[PDB]
UniProtKB/Swiss-Prot annotation, chain A:
Residue intervals passing through the bilayer: none
Full protein name: Capsid protein VP1
Cystine pairings recorded for this chain: none
Location in the cell: Virion; Host nucleus
Function of the molecule: Capsid protein self-assembles to form an icosahedral capsid with a T=1 symmetry, about 22 nm in diameter, and consisting of 60 copies of two size variants of the capsid proteins, VP1 and VP2, which differ by the presence of an N-terminal extension in the minor protein VP1. The capsid encapsulates the genomic ssDNA. Capsid proteins are responsible for the attachment to host cell receptors. This attachment induces virion internalization predominantly through clathrin-dependent endocytosis.
Highest taxon above the source species: Viruses
Keyword Transport annotated: no
Upper classification of the organism: Viruses, Monodnaviria, Shotokuvirae, Cossaviricota, Quintoviricetes
Main location: virion
Family: Belongs to the parvoviridae capsid protein family.
GO terms, biological process: clathrin-dependent endocytosis of virus by host cell; microtubule-dependent intracellular transport of viral material towards nucleus; symbiont entry into host cell via permeabilization of host membrane; viral penetration into host nucleus; virion attachment to host cell
GO CC annotation: host cell; host cell nucleus; T=1 icosahedral viral capsid
Part of the intact protein present: 188 to 729 of 729
Species this protein is from: Murine minute virus (strain MVMi) (MVM)
General remark: The capsids of autonomous parvoviruses expose a proportion of VP2 N-terminus and part of that sequence can be cleaved of to form VP3.
Keyword set, alphabetical order: Capsid protein, Clathrin-mediated endocytosis of virus by host, Cytoplasmic inwards viral transport, Host nucleus, Host-virus interaction, Magnesium, Metal-binding, Microtubular inwards viral transport, T=1 icosahedral capsid protein, Viral attachment to host cell, Viral penetration into host cytoplasm, Viral penetration into host nucleus, Viral penetration via permeabilization of host membrane, Virion, Virus endocytosis by host, Virus entry into host cell
UniProtKB/Swiss-Prot annotation, chain B:
Name this polypeptide is given: Capsid protein VP1
Subcellular localization(s) per the UniProt record: Virion; Host nucleus
Interval of the full protein contained in this chain: 388 to 436 of 729
Job description of the protein: Capsid protein self-assembles to form an icosahedral capsid with a T=1 symmetry, about 22 nm in diameter, and consisting of 60 copies of two size variants of the capsid proteins, VP1 and VP2, which differ by the presence of an N-terminal extension in the minor protein VP1. The capsid encapsulates the genomic ssDNA. Capsid proteins are responsible for the attachment to host cell receptors. This attachment induces virion internalization predominantly through clathrin-dependent endocytosis.
Highest classification ranks of the organism: Viruses, Monodnaviria, Shotokuvirae, Cossaviricota, Quintoviricetes
Domain notes from UniProt: The N-terminus of VP1 is sequestered within the mature capsid. It contains a phospholipase A2-like region and putative nuclear localization signals.
Family: Belongs to the parvoviridae capsid protein family.
Cysteine pairs bridged by disulfides in the record: none
Organism encoding this protein: Murine minute virus (strain MVMi)
Length: 542, 49
């Protein structure tokens, strides 16, 4: 029984049991590599350049003749409209349980005959043929998010989809030196490396999971994994260290709707600050804590694996348009995962998501630091600004190396993106876990949903010799349906303001970002999936 | 802060043929893994296609 809907079961006190029903046809071909491959990759074509090193793609993954089936993407469960309904009504959400099923396994073989006429291809199924499925329920094999490369499943129901072959990383110990523009001399050593005996881990689907053979009239069903995660708010904050608590007392009241009021003499005004000055002001007054913080810009660190961009907690872009300063993210999807279908060339569509947790972002331009016993008008050498060169570099200011993180440093968890966006994520087997993940909003406190793998049964020919180099195998491919159940808990927000709040609405056919025509089919049936606003309603931090 | 073994603990005298035994303290700690990691920000998840 096919089914791809979304049911909202309302309970008491304003709690809802959201149910996600996703069914989709899948396609799989014979895994070319009949055996596991430990292939290496070195892009000397770019790593050799002086200015290039941020394009480093050196590593050594292990290719497995298996294909992974990951549906870890909101865009595959919920329907565009549905996500809207949610964000506009809810106030928080959390994962409940998962359930998957497989059925209607079709296995066909191809026979390119008609050599005495032209070159036609004949198709016909095979029952005896068999597919292979297993579930890494214990999570032995490395975790591989399909959305970590936009290789999940189709976001469009009436349009089939294929699985992304499974492949994991391996220890190698890469190395690359630092160089700029042209500089002078050589790139020292851009060595790759060999496998170490202490960090060598070669797993095998066969010696890790109980594979199950499924023929034509067979079908498989998983258990019912229960999610143990923390709910995420569906609202955005705005307040900053300036708007926290009792606002200054007013001594002057406006006469008309034009002019404003005044405060009390900074010197003769009550309050408390952390400075030695004998006055008060919003900018220096004490605050409950720290809203957001300064993060090192473009911080590229390096270990035995090589250089990499140190992840940074997403935040408000601020008036300063500082994207790469507040960790905003840029995605690159394609067709199945969004993007218009009438787009030519392999050019993948992109989009930069700027977090809406205002008051937590930072503007480098205005960011400064005074010195010693604070002075009213700071001298010149008594105040460093985002205009002072550090370490003999003109464009390198304190901002690109300052870390304002600390005890009082409190912030807001990043909101997920509708299409493309990732749902949950396995936790690192590290003694001391990270306060959160940016890859996804929900992290399984305990064990995580076992990954699902698939593989077509190696259909042999009459001529077979193991000792024989590379030998034939009857051409084959298969298709099957996948049903998924995703239940979630959430509570409806409460209308308490007065002034109508911001809602995620659409607009007539216009140049507006919210144009209906954007989610509507074309004269030929083409269409796209544009990311949608999460947390349209404002909240209140203090 | 000047402490004194005498004004803090109940000392016990033990002669030649004497002997002492403590209670049975129960440890309340967190286990430690006996394996090493290797993965870095380069080897985390879905490797390039």
């Amino acid at each position: 029984s096919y089914d791809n809907q979304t049911h909202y079961r309302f309970l008491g006190d304003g709690w809802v049991e959201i149910t996600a029903l996703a069914t989709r046809l899948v396609h799989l071909n014979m895994p070319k590599s009949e055996n596991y491959c430990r292939i290496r990759v070195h892009n000397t074509t770019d790593t050799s350049v002086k200015g290039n090193m941020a394009k480093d793609d050196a590593h050594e993954q292990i290719w497995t003749p298996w294909s992974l089936v990951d549906a870890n993407a909101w865009g595959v469960w919920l329907q565009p409209s549905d996500w809207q309904y949610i964000c506009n009504t809810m106030s928080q959400l959390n994962l409940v349980s998962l359930d998957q099923e497989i059925f209607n396994v079709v296995l066909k073989t191809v026979t390119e005959q008609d050599s005495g006429g032209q070159a036609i291809k004949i198709y016909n199924n095979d029952w005896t043929a068999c597919m292979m499925v297993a579930v890494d329920s214990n999570n032995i094999l490395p975790y591989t998010p399909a959305a970590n490369s936009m290789e999940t499943l189709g976001f469009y129901p009436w349009k089939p989809t294929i699985a992304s072959p499974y492949r994991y990383y391996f220890c190698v110990d890469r190395d690359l030196s630092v160089t700029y523009e042209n500089q002078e001399g050589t790139i020292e050593h851009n060595v790759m490396g060999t496998p170490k005996g202490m960090n060598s881990q070669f797993f095998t689907i066969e010696n890790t999971q109980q594979i199950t053979l499924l023929r034509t009239g067979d079908e498989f069903a998983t258990g019912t994994y229960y999610f143990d995660t923390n709910p995420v708010k569906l609202t955005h904050t705005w307040q900053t260290n300036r708007q926290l608590g009792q606002p200054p007392l007013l001594s002057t009241f406006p006469e008309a709707d034009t002019d404003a009021g005044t405060l009390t003499a900074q010197g003769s005004r009550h309050g408390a600050t952390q400075m030695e000055v004998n006055w008060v002001s919003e900018a220096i007054r004490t605050r409950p804590a720290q809203v957001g913080f300064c993060q090192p810009h473009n911080d590229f660190e390096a270990s035995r694996a090589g250089p990499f961009a140190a992840p940074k907690v997403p935040a408000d872009v601020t008036q300063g348009m500082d994207r790469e300063a507040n960790g905003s993210v840029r995605y690159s999807y394609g067709k199945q995962h969004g993007e218009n279908w009438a787009a030519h060339g392999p050019a993948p569509e992109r989009y930069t998501w700027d977090e809406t947790n205002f008051g937590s972002g930072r503007d480098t331009r205005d960011g400064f630091i005074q010195s010693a016993p604070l002075v009213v008008p700071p001298p010149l050498n008594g105040i460093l600004t985002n205009a002072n060169p550090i370490g003999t570099k003109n464009d390198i200011h304190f901002s690109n190396v300052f870390n304002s993180y600390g005890p009082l440093t409190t912030f807001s968890h990043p909101s997920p993106v509708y299409p493309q966006g990732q749902i949950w994520d396995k936790e690192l087997d590290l003694e001391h876990k990270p306060r959160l993940h940016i890859t996804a909003p929900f992290v399984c406190k305990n064990n995580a949903p076992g990954q699902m793998l698939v593989r077509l049964g190696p259909n042999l020919t009459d001529q077979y010799d193991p000792n024989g180099a590379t030998l034939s195998r009857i051409v084959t491919y298969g298709t099957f349906f996948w049903k998924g159940k995703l239940t979630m808990r959430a509570k409806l927000r409460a209308n308490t303001t007065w002034n109508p709040v911001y809602q995620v609405s659409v607009e007539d056919n216009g140049n507006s970002y919210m144009s209906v025509t954007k989610w509507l089919p074309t004269a030929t049936g083409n269409m796209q999936s544009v990311p949608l606003i999460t947390r349209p309603v404002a909240r209140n931090t203090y």
